[PDB]
Curated annotation (Swiss-Prot), chains A, B:
InterPro entries: Ketosteroid_isomerase, NTF2-like_dom_sf, SnoaL-like. It comes from the Bacteria. Homodimer. Substrate binds at residue 103. Its EC number is 5.3.3.1. The gene is ksi. One of its GO terms (biological process) is steroid metabolic process. Induction: By steroids. Changing residue 103 to E: Slightly reduces activity. Reduces activity 10000-fold. The keyword Transmembrane helix does not apply. Changing residue 103 to N: Reduces activity 4-fold. Reduces activity 10000-fold. It comes from Pseudomonas putida. This is Steroid Delta-isomerase.
């Protein structure tokens, strides 16, 4: 595809959450541009490229039974960007915890995630 | 105050929504840095400075009985930034419409909004 329309952004960002929810690391990595930048959480140094992104997601979505779901609609722009609210459920010290997150994404002219910023901090975690 | 902590960002961004909800234009303008940039919707040219921001808000929050409420928690960073989901209710052609929005804000070292980006498009409007 080309630079995603607002409707296409909604579709792509919702698909991303579906992939996080099932934990398909390889499928998530393929949604990213080969040289994408990820800031997660926003405020920490960016990581870069699909190798680093794969390592990041495998560490995050490997062991525990992670779930993820949108908690409101995707807000999309007309310049290939969007933002969405979601909740991530994960098991910590064998305790179920939930994390509220907002992801902002910019897509490239091929429909892959060029940049993403994940807004959250410890205030957004519930043990 | 100084560069807002994550907790302070949550407070400030929630206060902003409260001010939009009551429609206190002057109070909203004072939350912004004197030279702040606003992109609303994200994708359109930025406006700059409190005069332009006051004009923007007066046009948006003047006539109709606008309401606004958070539709999830504020996601705050440790570098003075945050993101929040909310819904704006407004009257269009005398028809009540609702707009789902995510605002991303960066605060300056005095606790004022330096930049803000409002993510939404027509897909997010309900007439």
């Amino acid at each position: 595809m080309n630079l995603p329309t607002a409707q296409e952004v909604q579709g792509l960002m919702a698909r991303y959450i579906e992939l996080v929810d099932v934990g398909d690391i390889e499928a998530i990595v393929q949604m990213y541009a080969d040289d994408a930048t990820v800031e997660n959480p926003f405020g920490q140094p960016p990581i870069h490229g699909r190798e680093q992104i794969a390592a990041f997601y495998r560490q995050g979505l490997g062991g525990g039974k992670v779930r993820a779901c949108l908690t409101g609609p995707v807000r999309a722009s007309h310049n290939g960007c969007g933002a969405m609210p979601f909740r991530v459920e994960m098991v910590w010290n064998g305790q179920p915890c939930a994390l509220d997150v907002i992801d902002v994404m910019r897509f490239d002219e091929h429909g892959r995630i060029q940049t993403m910023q994940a807004y959250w901090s410890e205030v957004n975690l519930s043990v």
